[PDB]
Amino acid sequence: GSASSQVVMPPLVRGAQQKNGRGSDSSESCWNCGRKASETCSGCNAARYCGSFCQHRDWEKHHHVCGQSLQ
């Protein structure tokens, strides 16, 4: 029973921007379930999430999207 080296999904933060855009502009769906997304990945902030349970399920497929800054 050791932590070893395992990558876990980070919690989704609540996005709030007004300077650029007024709601989303580009895309507006949850990567996991696709039903109205209003939060972002606290890590890369690239993927869209609506809940913690959604992020975990999609986390397997997020492994290649996280840690890639913006390219």
Work out how close the CB of 29 gets to Zn ion at its nearest, in angstroms, rounded to a whole number. Answer: 9
Considering CB under 5 A, how many residues would be counted as binding Zn ion? 9
Work out how close the CB of 11 gets to Zn ion at its nearest, in angstroms, rounded to a whole number. Answer: 11
Name which position in 38, 40, 43, 56 contacts Zn ion (CB under 5 A).
Answer: 43
Task: Please classify residue 9 by burial: count the beta carbons closer than 10 Å to its beta carbon, then call 0-12 exposed, 13-18 middle and 19+ buried.
Answer: buried
Buried b (16+ CB within 10 A) or exposed e, 31-44: bbeeeebebbbebe
Q: Which residues bind Zn ion (CB under 5 A)?
A: 30, 32-33, 41, 43-44, 50, 54, 66
